[PDB]
Design a protein around this ligand. Structure first.
Ligand SMILES: NC(=O)C1=CN([C@@H]2O[C@H](COP(=O)(O)OP(=O)(O)OC[C@H]3O[C@@H](n4cnc5c(N)ncnc54)[C@H](OP(=O)(O)O)[C@@H]3O)[C@@H](O)[C@H]2O)C=CC1
Ligand SMILES: NC(=O)C1=CN([C@@H]2O[C@H](COP(=O)(O)OP(=O)(O)OC[C@H]3O[C@@H](n4cnc5c(N)ncnc54)[C@H](OP(=O)(O)O)[C@@H]3O)[C@@H](O)[C@H]2O)C=CC1
Ligand SMILES: NC(=O)C1=CN([C@@H]2O[C@H](COP(=O)(O)OP(=O)(O)OC[C@H]3O[C@@H](n4cnc5c(N)ncnc54)[C@H](OP(=O)(O)O)[C@@H]3O)[C@@H](O)[C@H]2O)C=CC1
Ligand SMILES: NC(=O)C1=CN([C@@H]2O[C@H](COP(=O)(O)OP(=O)(O)OC[C@H]3O[C@@H](n4cnc5c(N)ncnc54)[C@H](OP(=O)(O)O)[C@@H]3O)[C@@H](O)[C@H]2O)C=CC1
Ligand SMILES: O=C(O)CCC(=O)C(=O)O
Ligand SMILES: O=C(O)CCC(=O)C(=O)O
Ligand SMILES: O=C(O)CCC(=O)C(=O)O
Ligand SMILES: O=C(O)CCC(=O)C(=O)O
Lengths: 456, 452, 455, 448
């Protein structure tokens, strides 16, 4: 009646809260009970009209948001999303996620997220540029390299980051790390494109190693991936590089499934075309030869790939929120899936997580939440901030190694934390990475909040 | 693409009222360019939400949500009050700021549209808790306001005490002394008619309404006036009605109404004001002052009831409490009781149904409704006069501010009347106010490139 | 351990004892909470001021700005360039300024600043370099809505001009950041005369109330100390009103006459003091003006109070602690019935004790500086109003506003002293000291409570 | 000028160290510097209004002295103690200028604090005060302007409350303060920094004085105070094989002969966090301070005279905590090495005694601005980590601290020798810092 209905935010909130209460944490230190109703209310939200001009010279209006959620661990850090579904609820769920994700990267980065209900698809680069300019001119006053460092997300990539950076510099007359994901010649980092997907696959590497005592790797594993964006493209490429077989990709209109695995050239063509806002249907149509040989793929319109891949070992939802239903989760378990890790933010529904966790101690089915598995993107963003602040640019190998080490440490932190605060430690079984990640992030943020007087 | 925007019923009510007043006129046909403005002006230029953390008297941590909606800055810096009330959310404050744009436009002063507040509840709370909350609030807010950017003021739950605490917090954070807020204390930049402003202005507007409706043959002399609420607006509306020879037949608050038949007296309003400063109920106020409410000026307290149906024959109604406090049925009850003049002291005091009833009785039973964005604009007008006094480094006399308020209210009535007639018995002041304010704001937005 | 600050403690004790010896804390005890808050300045700024003299050598001085209280408005106060300047003196001055400004009825906070830099007998080039250095250290912390300084001892129109230029060069803004500005770049017309004219207007109202309009300044002997802006224009107003100015003084000696100092003598003193001349040197340089029927006796190293015989009015207009208890007794014995400070805290506690002890018996009426000399800051506030309105008022308009401000101040002192007196003598003069202190304190304290500065 | 005895003490010490040398004769331009550098660039005093747990209004004085910024942004701690006044903070900031100069880092001089007393006060009252203080102060500091830190009465808890207040007012997350928590931008050796650095400096002192024939091995070391400086100086002395014969606090001293143990220091630290006296801590943990490692508590007395034969003395408590009589008592007790963990720990009389016995009895005195510069050095290393957006390992920071302290020792020795007439480490440190700061002031046009 008073508070507005914000279901996605409430979903993320409930996931974290139920992970924290279902543990020994409040018993061992009840002071943490004070923290939940404070950290969950954002330090600041900024909504603004974004007025711009389309190619016909008509006036267009969209809503722009920047949610600066938590700054205990550092300046606000988070991506920007341009998608017609964007509202305060979605951005609140994303920023709440981001707080504890950033806590898991071990770098000094606060939580935030922003975007607009602007729809960039099938739009000219001129219209995108005008909207980014107007948007950043509305936002510039409230961000800065020590205050709030946005980046990309759905609908926001290198092109959009470039337009935004230029607009910011024209308004504020500063050249600094006000954004991450910048171009390599004007302050970018080398592994930032690959970061999220590579990090997800590294995290699943460590998962597999722990689950099989080093007896299995990504070697010969069937991997079902959703989405076809930055996360999905580079997760697929790393799975291919590590000897797995990528059996699926998807987008907003359908899925593509193969049985022998998607090839790297196919991912490259998909990436190039997705830059041009092509559907997977249109790309399998445009490159008939490339998607028809021994590496042919079947395009299934209107369907998510989880049920359409048969036996599968690993599942990497890498598209959007709530893209794995309870039904799809049960189907994955029945199809032999033993590793599910979100490259997307809150990719799994509450029901999917219930299924995965209920199959954990019995079928060895191991689920890792996005705030742990996909934190490589913000991790390498923070590394870009480090390079910018140091006025240096690191090599490919240096950033990749730091990314690998950050992902592995995050896995170990999830595992050991889940063990430390488990109510009944079922030995010969796998501890909850969900609970582990949520509790580790919460403890770090809450300790810092106490220290700084944000809670008492 | 579906159901993205959050549910904001109060904002949509204000929006629909203004839009339907603008569409049902010759305005879009005579100049269709105005059609471009509705979807731009209706999206606020800027909104700021912030956590307000404070400490209660036990040393416990309390958390509330704070908002400042800076809606439109075409005609001047953002101008609007602050509301501390447990119902506060983005929707209510958006409706209030959207209203405020065109209200401020009707005052003829250079004032943009805005509004703010928090779901903090000050009722029965110590002045220490109020002070701590105001400090935390203003510390989160100051960075975004200024005497040339955004000049907040009071509203429900925010009066002189809260404005003072907020001003102190602002001065400590920003190290400047200026008209960053209106409704300030007289010794540190306030104006003399600002407390009285809203109710006095409502009564002045209804003065001009009655004069036009009766060709100067009737005044407030001997009129039965039903007022709701017992706050700043209602108190001073009642006092002005008394001074003008009317009989105030009712007041109310969140728990019940009080009704009289000889009229409420000025001493009764003074006692109610003093007691409401300490968060007393009207029930408790008639209990605590038995002598004052029992003679020929006795009052009956009706718990849980609004005064509209409980007053018998009534000539004028001044809802001066909150939004949506006059139902369609209560509007019919007023019409049946002979009510011919209705002017909102509160913001959006009438439901859409009540406005439909009054307008449907306009040409036939001569029932004349005036919306809040016209009638209660005296408060923000005298706020702007406070801003002018601050900018000039002067303080005006009682009569100077009272006269400027009077002329602004009368000019507002004349503008509503002429505009209602120009784009169409008694003309609809609802349409008049909405269209006049809309035209002024939209011309300024066109001139400044906010719309093209 | 608190540092020794005698001048500040003097002003503090004066105000505190005026408020305690009244019905005030009985009528509203909440005010007791305000004394230990308001008496600690909101902010103090100390800074090194490095400059270059005419030989091209580096000189170093201390610069201060004490921003004491901002409840009633932005910090308002003058700047003093004098070698005795330290934090203690400026704290007393800014503390004074709080309640003085409160009495002017304008929106003005309390503050004061300056430097131990000594401008006497120094070239205009050295003064310009020092003003530039000083204002560049200070500008970051002042502004037309934050802190509006002006002149004082050692700082006049020339120094205000250099300061305004340096500020405009650093901050790139043209606004009322200072008062006492030149007429062509944002100044006001009565500001030079303001303090002395207002002091004499206050004594006008004093005489009127004390004698039921039967006496005026007509035919009164008036002893003035000092020879600066306050003293010059107080003397000119006394002359214009038909009185006889029997003395002036400076840091080296006094000048005494028996027919009264003339306006032309005052003009010459002003012109020569602009060039840092002593009274000895000015009576030597203009022998023609100081030798006829208007001859003058120069007494080196002496204050004029004991050296004038019978005198009716005394206007100390030079510096702090310039009337000792002995000089107060001498003035009482010489028949003085009106004493009003043109300088800030001109009288020692002993002198005030003498005057107050003779109030109800000999009708001897003392008015403190925070009431009597508030005309200067009042017209400075009017300069701020003119700048804010982008208008400049006529001579007569500002002079009239000054007169009404001074009269309002006297009436407030009188009525406030009577309202809260525990002397309760039907007959007798009420304490203007207590009146001014209590009225100013009440206004400032109410504002502090409203704004949450005290709770 | 107002009476400022502590500032004048520090000023006179530095000036007499510089004048009693060949410096002004070799290059007389330095004569212009003393009356400039000794006047602080800027001082900010402000009322700090706060609210106690009873809801009553409390008022205190807050100061920030930004003394000299030639070598970098102002760097200095914050002291909450009822004795705080402008004189004390001026003495500390004047010291800090040349201390920072000796650390070889880009750090100006400054110091601040309040007469607020944190003793026996609830964490809520401390948080409210820190909030009021930092909200009054933030406008004048910044990661490139003035980076405060802790001192007496201000530790990790207070640094946390202050950092929160600053971030809430200025909306920036950066290295505006040092001594921050490890999880929000802190450094790994910062707690240990000052005492560890003092002990490393005395390592090099002993080494130079005996040509490497002696170390801290088997030496009697008398420590005063029981705060951060004293705690970690004691821990480093223990780790290096010395015997800690004493500690002290504001109420009395504790003395033993078998050496203070690490567990005892840990308990003292935990209890001092709750504002317990040494009397109360030896009472509350009788087992830990009465067994084979028992300790004798002498109330109201400084430990220097109550420890018998002693080799090293580390005053680690406050200013003017070693009198001339106590200096003679230490010399007679066989002390040959004295290094101040506190700022201006020794009185003029104690320093005169030590220097007068230097060339004859080989007693070596090192001033605090050289010996205790490890704390501000690791503060600067925290600043470097923040600016780089990195956090270093324990070993990395410990090694950088060690090398900085050793470099400072060599600079003291070499500079004392270059301009003299065992060399005086006092004059060495003072002259090295003065030369660096003065050259920088000349270059930037602060002196001409
Ligand atoms: N980019 C980064 O660095 C980071 C991204 N993430 C998370 O990964 C997920 C995707 O990121 P990213 O690769 O950058 O996004 P992209 O814009 O690169 O692509 C997103 C993919 O998801 C699909 N998709 C988008 N919207 C919907 C929808 N409403 N319903 C169904 N499918 C949809 C898109 O299909 P189509 O192309 O047809 O529109 C596209 O295939 C998000 O949850 C994001 O927050 C997490 C960490 C960092
Ligand atoms: N103050 C001003 O200058 C201006 C005010 N207004 C409008 O006037 C109306 C009230 O103004 P104001 O006098 O300042 O407010 P006040 O706080 O002084 O009092 C408001 C009155 O309305 C009653 N009331 C408040 N909320 C509710 C509710 N949710 N349900 C039922 N009754 C309620 C209150 O009852 P109770 O005392 O029991 O809480 C109180 O009597 C608002 O619509 C405001 O926006 C318009 C122009 C300017
Ligand atoms: N100027 C203004 O607008 C205001 C001034 N006042 C107060 O009035 C007094 C003087 O003001 P103003 O006329 O403008 O100042 P000026 O600089 O114009 O002159 C001050 C006069 O007092 C003499 N004098 C100054 N200091 C001392 C001293 N320490 N000991 C002895 N004699 C001294 C000077 O003598 P000489 O120069 O010949 O050596 C000079 O004649 C001060 O107390 C000031 O605070 C109050 C209100 C406003
Ligand atoms: N902290 C740092 O990094 C650095 C510190 N220093 C200097 O070291 C000294 C202490 O620092 P720190 O350890 O952090 O402070 P702490 O507040 O942690 O403790 C200081 C110790 O000295 C005692 N003490 C404090 N004041 C007095 C006094 N007036 N008279 C006698 N004994 C007293 C205290 O006793 P009790 O607890 O009972 O009050 C406590 O045992 C200061 O002079 C400081 O300037 C120098 C370089 C850096
Ligand atoms: O790079 C960042 O700022 C965060 C990346 C991102 O979009 C996320 O973690 O959700
Ligand atoms: O600005 C003011 O005077 C209060 C504004 C307000 O709430 C109104 O006019 O309805
Ligand atoms: O003009 C001002 O700002 C103050 C004038 C002055 O010198 C004083 O009142 O002390
Ligand atoms: O460590 C710091 O940064 C402040 C300096 C200090 O406390 C000291 O060395 O005395």
């Amino acid at each position: 009646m008073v508070l507005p209905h914000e279901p996605e935010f409430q979903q993320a909130y409930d996931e974290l809260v139920s992970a924290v209460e279902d543990s020994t944490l409040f018993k061992e230190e009840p002071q943490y009970k004070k923290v939940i109703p404070v950290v969950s209310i954002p330090e600041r939200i900024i909504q603004f009209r974004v007025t711009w001009e389309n190619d016909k010279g008509e006036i267009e209006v969209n809503n722009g948001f920047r949610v600066q959620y938590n700054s205990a661990l550092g300046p606000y850090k988070g991506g920007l999303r341009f998608h017609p579904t964007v509202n305060l609820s979605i951005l609140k769920f994303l920023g709440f996620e981001q707080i504890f994700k950033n806590a898991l990267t071990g770098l000094s980065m606060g939580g935030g997220k922003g975007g607009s209900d602007f729809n960039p698809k099938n739009r000219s680069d001129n219209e995108i540029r005008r909207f980014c300019v107007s948007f950043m001119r509305q936002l510039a006053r409230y961000i800065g390299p020590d205050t709030d460092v946005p980046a990309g997300d759905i609908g926001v990539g290198g092109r959009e980051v470039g337009f935004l950076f230029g607009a910011y510099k024209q308004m504020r007359n500063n050249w600094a790390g006000v954004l991450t994901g910048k171009g390599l010649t004007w302050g970018g980092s080398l592994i930032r494109p690959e970061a999220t997907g590579y990090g997800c696959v590294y995290y699943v590497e460590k998962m597999i190693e722990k689950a099989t005592n080093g007896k299995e790797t990504f070697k010969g594993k069937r991997v079902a991936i959703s989405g076809s964006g930055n996360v999905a493209q580079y997760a697929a490429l790393k799975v291919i590089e590590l000897g797995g077989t990528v059996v699926s990709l998807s987008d907003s209109k359908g899925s593509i499934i193969s049985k022998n695995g998607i090839t790297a050239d196919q991912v490259y063509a998909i990436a190039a075309a997705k830059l041009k806002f092509k559907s997977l249907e249109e790309i399998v149509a445009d490159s008939v030869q490339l998607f028809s040989g021994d590496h042919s793929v079947e395009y299934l319109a209107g369907v998510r790939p989880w049920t359409k891949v048969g036996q599968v070992d690993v599942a990497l939802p890498s598209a959007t929120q709530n893209e794995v239903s309870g039904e799809e989760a049960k189907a994955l378990v029945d199809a032999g899936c033993k590793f599910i890790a979100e490259g997307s933010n809150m990719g799994s529904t509450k029901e999917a997580i219930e299924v995965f966790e209920a199959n954990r101690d019995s079928n060895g089915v191991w689920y890792a939440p996005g705030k742990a598995a996909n934190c490589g993107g913000v991790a390498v963003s923070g590394l870009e901030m480090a390079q910018n602040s140091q006025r240096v640019q690191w090599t490919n190998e240096e950033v990749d190694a730091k990314l690998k080490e950050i992902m592995y440490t995050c896995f170990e932190n999830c595992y050991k934390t889940a063990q430390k605060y488990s109510i009944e430690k079922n030995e010969n079984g796998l501890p909850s990475l969900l609970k582990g990640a949520n509790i580790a992030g919460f403890i770090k943020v809450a300790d810092a909040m106490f220290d700084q007087g944000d809670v008492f």
